[PDB]
Write a protein that binds this ligand. Structure first.
Ligand code: NA
Ligand code: NA
Ligand code: NA
Ligand code: NA
Lengths: 445, 445
């Protein structure tokens, strides 16, 4: 009777149709029929993203592609645990309130000026986003933004107070493209192609450094009247208490090990997923040092996403095993040889940057990385380039809300118009397709 | 400076001491040193049970026993997912309120008598416990018990109103020993020895049927003045609404498949962990039928326990790989041949039943099943017997609180004395060591 129940039933119909009607070797038919079924479910979201992720192994198994245990093993991938270490690290500095003090210490550096208030609001949002999450950083920044935008209160003076709301909503998304922890898509890329923490930072951080100024400049050069205003530093000040220096101490130590993983691990005997161990070592240090309880981590951890990760890895392996990856490469062979590498990565970048407006970031990456990376491997090219690209471009959701929660968070502020965001995003989207295709070209040789 | 930080430091010392001072083949030294370290941490609970579980792979990897990924793979065991299916099934019928209606429909069968009120309170607690959890079933039953024990309100008339509080606190623990979902220890046994859902029910259910009357009879024959009293059916009645018949429908279908798994799977082509697939199929049916959202399951699911499971499976594999399992069998060889099989299982049963009073049920099972099962295998005997025994006896916590949350739940009722529970438990403990050793003997040939 419901909308989504029909989408699912239409999909069951579609699968059945593709299964009985495609003219190929049985394995490829099954692989294509599955890929379409799952592609629908993750884009429409008729079933919850994670329910769909669970549906993958259960299909793979029932259709004899993998044995039950083999399929489930996907969910214990070392990157998944790295990301859990991220959640525990976040959980710690949120319960401790080290995120609050980083906001105040930097916000009060601005004596009382609105010009150097919002420029220090975006800089903190993105810095805090590197380690925490996007949705979490947005929900945490909202009250701190509304607090500052109450002196220039006049909402007939909207464009002073919309530049700042839409500004952090993007700064949360751009801050994610910095490190391996931060947003889901990055983790999915790293798991697929086998990236280290320091590897994804070499790609991502420069792109964040490039993108944040570029994004503000676009918001600025639309309708900003913010060179005027005064401050209202209204609430109790902050101070380093029982081991906020300790949480920062562990955090610092962890990040130090993550960056210097290459020489530290090499000169340690070369353990396998060193970054994952570090991330679990973090969970251990935070508990021995007593700085955060487990119940806290169990609330903060998004087990839904953790499961989603493995759901996509299962899919990736479904594509290989059925030979669907190689069949698609064969079908695209003529098209891709006719296309220049510039043309390809421009088409890819454009495809995601706009697709990501309709569906969740992860939901699109969890679908697209498997397809592209495995097809890239059939072409015998390094699946890294396309993957990192997709992972970054997925986090470029700037147009409507429902694209990312950070967009819907600053939108529920019952103030910003649908039309307004839709056109700043349409500019920033094109701006990014440029920047990415540019940087993706530069990172070739 | 804290108590537990010293326990941990004392343990780090102990490990270091055992590591540098034991006179054996390096692998066995490492295996022994690890086993002692982890044993301490799970019994003292200096670190949280789950933090300790994570510590296992991280040690195994750093001490070259397993490669990072191989060790983590333990956490994706098919039983863990079976148990997650249990959590989702519970989450459904709690959010739907199918547990409430099962309480009222059976409680109102008793017209208005206290004699047939509490006897129908224990019967519901245990039946509801089979599928839900122990801690969850206790916290859910508490208000429903205090509601009935307000007509015979006189708390100078204590023993009418302590027989019922301590009655359900046990009925929750005995109800767990019924099926594979229900309590952690059962799942740990099944994962270690490879049991089906219908397999553990053949052991457990008869034991629950035997134990519940035996437990009441002991509480009854101490200080019961409950053949007197009247009812107060005070609150809004219940009625089957939008698919509480559907949740029961799915639940019923799931349990039907679980019981009849053997012939259904056999006549289906023999899929690998059929019970796990059923449990995931449950998660899928519950979502397509829209009866429960995912956020609900993410709250209900105890991801801490889910992780604990794999922590112990990692340990089990640590014992084998280092050859510590075989070394212990050699050391115990003389002792066990001098002991009769009756003697052994009486010693084992007594050991756990009393050990489980000091530490969490899972925490003790997660420690003991690996040691015993793997040693049993070195002796070339089926590790099932000892394991199922340990798993059942672990759920026999009847003395103090802090033994199980269901004990601490009915204790926070600021009414029941420490001394009171301690001696009913001491009787029921001995009563059980009997029943188990009896049934364990009968289930031989
Ligand atoms: Na982020
Ligand atoms: Na998106
Ligand atoms: Na239970
Ligand atoms: Na216990």
């Amino acid at each position: 009777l419901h909308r989504n129940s029909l989408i699912v039933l239409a999909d069951v119909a579609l699968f059945l149709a593709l299964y009985h009607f495609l003219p190929f070797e049985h394995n490829v038919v099954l692989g294509i029929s599955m890929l379409a079924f799952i592609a629908v479910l993750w884009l429409t979201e008729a079933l919850h993203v994670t329910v769909t992720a669970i549906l993958v192994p259960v299909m793979a198994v029932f259709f004899g592609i993998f044995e039950t245990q083999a399929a489930l093993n996907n969910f214990a991938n070392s990157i998944i645990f790295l990301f859990l270490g991220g959640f525990a690290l976040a959980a710690a500095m949120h319960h401790q309130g080290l995120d609050k003090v980083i906001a105040d210490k930097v916000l009060a550096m601005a004596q009382g000026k609105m010009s150097v208030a919002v420029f220090m609001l975006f800089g903190v949002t993105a810095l805090l986003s590197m380690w925490i999450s996007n949705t979490a950083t947005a929900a945490m920044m909202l009250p701190l933004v509304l607090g500052v935008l109450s002196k220039v209160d006049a909402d007939k003076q909207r464009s002073t107070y919309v530049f700042v709301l839409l500004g952090v909503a993007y700064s949360a998304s751009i801050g994610g493209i910095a490190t391996l922890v931060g947003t889901g898509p990055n983790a999915i890329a790293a798991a697929e192609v086998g990236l280290s923490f320091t590897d994804w930072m070499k790609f991502g951080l420069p792109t964040a450094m490039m993108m944040l100024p570029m994004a503000i400049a676009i918001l600025y050069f639309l309708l900003k009247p913010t060179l005027n205003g005064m401050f209202e530093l209204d609430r109790a000040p902050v101070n380093w208490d029982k081991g906020k220096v300790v949480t920062l101490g562990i955090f610092g130590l962890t990040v130090f090990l993550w960056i210097f993983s290459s020489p530290i691990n090499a000169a340690l005997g070369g353990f396998k997923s060193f970054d994952t161990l570090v991330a679990l070592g973090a969970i251990l240090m935070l508990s021995f040092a007593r700085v955060v309880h487990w119940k806290e981590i169990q609330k903060t951890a998004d087990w839904g996403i953790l499961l989603l990760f493995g759901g996509g890895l299962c899919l990736s392996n479904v594509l290989k095993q059925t030979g669907t990856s190689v069949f698609l490469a064969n079908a695209l062979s003529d098209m891709v040889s006719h296309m220049g590498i510039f043309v390809v990565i421009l088409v890819v970048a454009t495809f995601v940057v706009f697709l990501t407006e309709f569906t969740s970031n992860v939901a699109t990456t969890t679908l697209l990385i498997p397809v592209f990376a495995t097809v890239a491997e059939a072409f015998g090219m390094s699946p890294v380039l396309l993957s990192v690209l997709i992972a970054v471009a997925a986090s470029c959701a700037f147009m409507l809300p429902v694209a990312t929660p950070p967009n819907a968070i600053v939108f529920a502020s019952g103030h910003i118009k649908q039309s307004e965001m839709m056109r700043v995003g349409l500019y920033l989207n094109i701006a990014c397709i440029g920047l990415l295709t540019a940087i993706a070209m530069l990172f070739w040789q």
